[PDB]
Amino acid sequence: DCPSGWSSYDGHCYQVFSDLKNWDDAESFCSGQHEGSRLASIHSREEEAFVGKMASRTLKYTSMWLGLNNPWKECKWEWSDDTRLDYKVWTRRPYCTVMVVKTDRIFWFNRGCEKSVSFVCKFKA
Amino acid sequence: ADCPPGWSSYDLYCYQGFNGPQTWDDAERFCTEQAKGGHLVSISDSGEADFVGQLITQNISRPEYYVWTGLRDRRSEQQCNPEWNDGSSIIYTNWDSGESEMCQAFSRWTNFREWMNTNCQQKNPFVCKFPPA
Numbered sequence: 088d089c090p091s092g093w094s095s096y097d098g099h100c101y102q103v104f105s106d107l108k109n110w111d112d113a114e115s116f117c118s119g120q121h122e123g124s125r126l127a128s129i130h131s132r133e134e135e136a137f138v139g140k141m142a143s144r145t146l147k148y149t150s151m152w153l154g155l156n157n158p159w160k161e162c163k164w165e166w167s168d169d170t171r172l173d174y175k176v177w178t179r180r181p182y183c184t185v186m187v188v189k190t191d192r193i194f195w196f197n198r199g200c201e202k203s204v205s206f207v208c209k210f211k212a
Numbered sequence: 213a214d215c216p217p218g219w220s221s222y223d224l225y226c227y228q229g230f231n232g233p234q235t236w237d238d239a240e241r242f243c244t245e246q247a248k249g250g251h252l253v254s255i256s257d258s259g260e261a262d263f264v265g266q267l268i269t270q271n272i273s274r275p276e277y278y279v280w281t282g283l284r285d286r287r288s289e290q291q292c293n294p295e296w297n298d299g300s301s302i303i304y305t306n307w308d309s310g311e312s313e314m315c316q317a318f319s320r321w322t323n324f325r326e327w328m329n330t331n332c333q334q335k336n337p338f339v340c341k342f343p344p345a
Binding site: 114173187 | 249261284304325326
């Protein structure tokens with residue numbers, strides 16, 4: 088139930104792309120490849136392992152954008168002495184999540200969303 | 213001022229920087245046991261921020277970028293964003309060690325005047341604060 092070029096897993100379709108794009112550009116590209124297609128979310132070890140195996144087939148350098156922009160959106164900052172948070176001097180440039188496939192392990196880490204990374208798209212069949 | 217020896221006074225409170233290094237939780241626990249009502253330092257205005265900044269520079273010589281503040285997100289999960297791009301809840305995560313950054317620290321490149329979130333399990337110097345009696 089996936090069109091040509093896409094791999095099926097658990098009612099969803101996936102495709103890894105090698106071209107290096109920044110997160111926004113990659114998310115835009117995914118959106119144009121199929122209805123409902125965006126940068127992949129990852130909801131389980133099994134799904135992660137499936138996506139990692141696609142990357143090892145397509146990419147020589149197996150790192151891919153995931154569909155997470157800004158891990159620190161809507162944080163609830165509190166003081167340990169329970170004083171009210173009014174004075175605030177925390178600003179941070181946008182970071183976006185990269186899934187790094189190593190031959191022994193898979194891990195995620197955050198990179199500046201302006202960096203150029205391969206990526207994987209995903210939509211529901 | 214009636215701040216005990218080793219502590220520095222500023223606007224009805226007592227402060228002291230501690231060359232750690234300690235995790236955020238261990239630093240905070242250390243602060244509560246150093247004096248009654250002690251905690252990791254909190255910042256309420258720019259004056260307190262400037263005092264704590266210079267206090268760190270004059271009493272903490274550490275090669276770290278970070279000195280712990282008392283500010284953090286208290287949740288057990290490793291990030292704040294509740295949803296992926298597609299709207300599905302973020303539940304399963306697989307952060308490499310050091311990538312979950314839910315605790316706030318004073319940053320050296322701002323002369324320890326502004327904050328940056330870093331790994332709560334990273335060991336850093338810290339500053340305690342308690343109200344004298």
